[PDB]
Amino acid sequence: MISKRIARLSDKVRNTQPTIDLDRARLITEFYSRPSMDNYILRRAKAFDYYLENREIFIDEDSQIAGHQGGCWEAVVMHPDVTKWLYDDFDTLDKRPSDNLAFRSAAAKEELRQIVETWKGQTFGDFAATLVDEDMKPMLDVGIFTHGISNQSTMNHSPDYDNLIKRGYRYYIDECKEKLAEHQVNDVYDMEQQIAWKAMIIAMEAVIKFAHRYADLANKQAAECIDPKRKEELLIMAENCRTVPENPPKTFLQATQLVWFNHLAISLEAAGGDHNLGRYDQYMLPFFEKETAEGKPEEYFADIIHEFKLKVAEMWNIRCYNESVADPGNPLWMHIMLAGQLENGKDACNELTNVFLRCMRDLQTDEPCITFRFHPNINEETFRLAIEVARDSGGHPAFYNDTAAITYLLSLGFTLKEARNWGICGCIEPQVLGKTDFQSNPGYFNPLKVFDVMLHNGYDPVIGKKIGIESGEVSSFTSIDDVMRAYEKQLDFFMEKFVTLANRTLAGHAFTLPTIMGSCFSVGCVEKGKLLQQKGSDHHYSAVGVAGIANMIDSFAAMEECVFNKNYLTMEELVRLLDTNFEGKENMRQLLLNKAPKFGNDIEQVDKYSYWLIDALDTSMKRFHDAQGGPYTVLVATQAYNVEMGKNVGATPDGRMAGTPLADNASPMVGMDVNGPTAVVNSLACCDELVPQSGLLLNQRFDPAVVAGEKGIDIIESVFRAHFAQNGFHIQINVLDDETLRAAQKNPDDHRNILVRVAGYSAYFVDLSEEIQNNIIERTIQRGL
Amino acid sequence: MISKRIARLSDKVRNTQPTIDLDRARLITEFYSRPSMDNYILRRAKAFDYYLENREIFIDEDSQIAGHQGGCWEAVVMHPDVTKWLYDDFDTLDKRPSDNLAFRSAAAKEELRQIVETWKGQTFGDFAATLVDEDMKPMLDVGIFTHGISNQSTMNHSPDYDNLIKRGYRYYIDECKEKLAEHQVNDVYDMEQQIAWKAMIIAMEAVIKFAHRYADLANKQAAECIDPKRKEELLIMAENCRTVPENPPKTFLQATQLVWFNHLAISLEAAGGDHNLGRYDQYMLPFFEKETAEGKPEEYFADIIHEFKLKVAEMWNIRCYNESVADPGNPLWMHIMLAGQLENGKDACNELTNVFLRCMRDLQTDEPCITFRFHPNINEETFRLAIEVARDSGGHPAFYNDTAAITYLLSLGFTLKEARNWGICGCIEPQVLGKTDFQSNPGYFNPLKVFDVMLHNGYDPVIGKKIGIESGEVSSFTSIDDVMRAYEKQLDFFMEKFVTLANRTLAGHAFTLPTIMGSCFSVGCVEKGKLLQQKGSDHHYSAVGVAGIANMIDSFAAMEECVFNKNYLTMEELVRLLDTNFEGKENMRQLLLNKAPKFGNDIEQVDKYSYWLIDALDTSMKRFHDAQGGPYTVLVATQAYNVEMGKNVGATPDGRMAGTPLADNASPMVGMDVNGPTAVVNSLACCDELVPQSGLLLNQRFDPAVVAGEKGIDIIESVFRAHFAQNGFHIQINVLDDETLRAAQKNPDDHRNILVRVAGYSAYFVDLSEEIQNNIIERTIQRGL
Ligand SMILES: O=C(O)[C@H]1C[C@H](O)CN1
């Protein structure tokens, strides 16, 4: 069904081999090699300007929208200034098991040399490493927590697109100028406001210059164009790129061209991801409505949305070799929000919502993450449509409950009107578009490794050493309640090592690594004259990535029913069994696995511990604030860390074997949800899903035959609405066969469009490692409920 | 009668040609050329270490103290990273008319030209240039004021030698380590403290490593040394440099080695000067007594004090070609304080004060400036000795009244015990040693130029632009009071412009240019974890250098006389008189010249205006605080700006002619004090000399025949004590023959040791330009009072 233009654009994205680009690396390295005493924030604006002035740019034949990250299709942009892993991990850059990257031409050496070696020891990531105390290094080694935003900028940019779409850069530039002219330096620290406004001005004029570069390219190409239809596309492009982003868009294409330009510019200034694109069906609606009444047909807009979506799919955010194994498929976590409600609470679904969903019906892209906002008065037509496409084309959208999200946000200090205008930076975490500086990556926390360390009263078998504290020798435990307290004591100590590292790191950013473009249109920054790292936003909070709950819940139900009720074994016998990885006593392993109930089967005796753990985690981290004064929130998600962190957790009492992967995110352990998906969501409702203010990341998988047709929607819609009626937040669907997934393993070339939801992002199954593929195939296939 | 060793050392300093050095310029430029995202304060510290690990060093055979700025005698260390003037003024650098410098090879181009080109547009001075508003540029151009600290660091450092000499660097390193260990980063700005302590550690361990380079070098020269006296010196030097500044010195020579290392380290980290050396006769006394008890003769200390004084006289602080002619001779303004009171108010003189004065009797060096602290209980021997030496030698103990300084410092928020430990950074401004961060260079202010603009109701005629405001039309002045109210409005306008620019600049240092070493032992910095620029000292205040006062006083007298009293002309006629430089009306200029009283002759009619003017400038600047929260204070001192600011002021009503030098500093104008030196100090008594906190700089010359014999060290007291009882602060004399200073121009190489006090600094007359020489020769010669 898709247009021929979109079929070629899609093909270029999906099939051009991704090549490492040296434009940015070369030009940034040359700018920072000019000695300077300019203040480092002004220097960084000026380095951004210099890079956008000299980098390569192309306009592909089929493109109606100007701009790519590179000067060729599928360029992979580099950040040797920020990323220290580009030194340690350099040799595997073009041999990865998750991220197919190639050099263009054995200018692998221009980068080995002239650049990565030149930066040795002086990258941002090298500064971040100096903030890690000696005791923390074993903690990081065995995977108790990770050191987030230590090789990326603070990322997670949420531009005020609702207002930017009406104003254009020149509005904010003039604001900074007006701010600058009435501002007095009375105190040394007042220079901060001067630097911030100036830097933001320099950077906004930089992007305008960048757009004018595409306009001139477009215009030269137009002069040599014989096809009248293309000649007109290019004169319209050149005209668009002289109008926008500097000025308000006049047309639907200009509005998309402004948002893309701004998105792209943010992507290139600093290493990082997770920037959102706002509520496209909302801020775009005046343009669709106007030009539609002018005669333009639905497909005019469809092709633009498709090119727009493909602009994002082409982007990369390369991470250290290790984050690329646990984040396989390279999530950008760049959301577009659809549906939800307006300020006054009435339905926000519109015609453009449907136009967009019908595009996804015809062509799905790995990114962006499409975030569909359910609410009680959601248009039923539109809701079921979104269900249709999640099952059919597969991949998107995930589904989100406005009533749960607005509760989280109000509990975080937002007003009702603000809460109604929420989106995501990251996997699933709610936030108020345009007015939040959400830190999605302080790091991850591994409750199960902490438990492992508690089962040995502070020593770690894996790396053999004392890294925790004495929470209590295991023989002294009278009850499940006694071991709960011993855990809470170990959890409290490690939660505080982690928050110390995270607070230190976010503070260091404030003295080394700005993000100017991402500040410009975050509400607060221009008004206060403070970039994001200097507390520019009115709202900061940090989500702790809690790597799973299922294994902890199950190993605690297993200890209660098998150690303290039925007394099948003391606890010293369990550590010996666990230490010895069940070598021999595999009869006993089956006792723990079958004789005690497992999470996700709507079994209150195991389900009671979900409430307990979410609560201790919330309580433990909430005795601190982050380095910008905001709360620490609970998020349950592992991405591929269930596998990678699992590799470092010995045998757990739930029956899980040493080094085997954990459950996936907040879902039950593989094989244990034997009672259908209404029971899985019923189990998650014992967490008190109004508590974790940055969400429970939930994966569900259905057999495509059983959820076929129109009654098949009714099954999915029921499972959904039942989740939401219990304050469920997020639900995420794969409608995929066990057999269909092995066919793509044996014959990847014939199944290069099966799109899987991994965690809070989607990826092409053939792009994923074989180890990660089998971990997605192990997921439970719900046959109904 | 001075030791052969001190004669040789003296010759090596006084006669080796200053040659521009490229170690710092080379090594620093090299370092800032390695790209780095490290924080710029940490980077500076590491830059500092790197330079100290690779600069050339050398040890003269006649030296017992290690360390020089260069690897040869009289090296001139360059600061291309800071000084913007190095580009625009490169060409004249080696053809200067009051500096006299030379390149060794064709390293003019070799390196130093190419190095400055590398830095082009990226020096600290370039960044400071951005802080000047458009409308301020004409004001700078015609010399209404000066952009202070725009090509230097905040400088003006004042180490806590009293404690340092007892603790060594290790004490402070360990205090940084302890504080770091306790410190939590709970807010982003808490990282400031981490960065401060770490940078101070790096910088102090760098100076220790540097000391070791000298130990290793001295040891090496010991073993090849065939003379057992010099061999023993070298082995002492080596043991010394393994001891200081890391640890508390144990000996007079070590205490001196420590002081010199610290001073020298500060001078090399960043451009600038005005660092004081403390009360040497005080903190050194325990070592002198213990070693004199042990049989060391006076001559042992006399030769260390001499070499130490020469170590400082060898130093350079190169300024731009403009400052290079208004500050002729390269003032370093590095004071050693002598005498004064102890904490309890008792006389602080001791044997070491005399030993020190005896050295100056025998050998005077241009720097350090020596400030003798007089007070009502001062030892009569010591005081009269100090006078003798000021007379029979390049006058160096200038004289300062403790009662007047302790009054200034009390009005500045200091305690009585604090104010007794006072010294100078700058020319004459009082501060509390170890506990003050005094800005001696916010910039100068030209009240006479402001007066010009007032006479033209806001216009500057030379440039024809209305750079000021509407003071009022001169044709409307009913009274001398009307003119005074007019000048006040103009003064307020330009004073606010000046303060705006100085405040912005001092803010600028706090985001670009640290002074780490000078922060280390400033009380407050290590305690608070703040370098000086981040408000580390408990006391910051800023002296506005007011370019003279005499011409203003005389002009207002001349106007009250000839315009308003005896109606010789009207205000419009006076203006035309002035706009034409008195052309064809020399009768009239003689009227204003002689029919109206002048300043410095104890005539109340004119002297009443000195109170009004000093009050107006104080009141006007007290509307504001500096950027660190401290007050602005008045410093009446022209330096040699009376020539270079003179050239931008038209004829004035006191009879001075367009382009003509102003009166020098806080003195009366050439020719006007005709009634003796005792009357000049009575005239300055109508200033109310308790009001200019930071002092009026007073120059007085005497005919050598008159004040000879003991009826000089009896008649000298005379004019001294009567200045002090009248609350006089500063009384600094030069006793040159006037016929001696003319013969010393025809035979330069024959009067190479003639040292004149030229505006709070002191220099050898055969090192000044002719224009600055013939102007120093127009100072009133007093034949007695
Ligand atoms: O690493 C990141 O980008 C964030 C994404 C997710 O919200 C949790 N960690």
Ligand SMILES: O=C(O)[C@H]1C[C@H](O)CN1
């Ligand atoms: O320019 C300077 O270095 C200071 C010195 C003295 O206080 C007058 N101004």
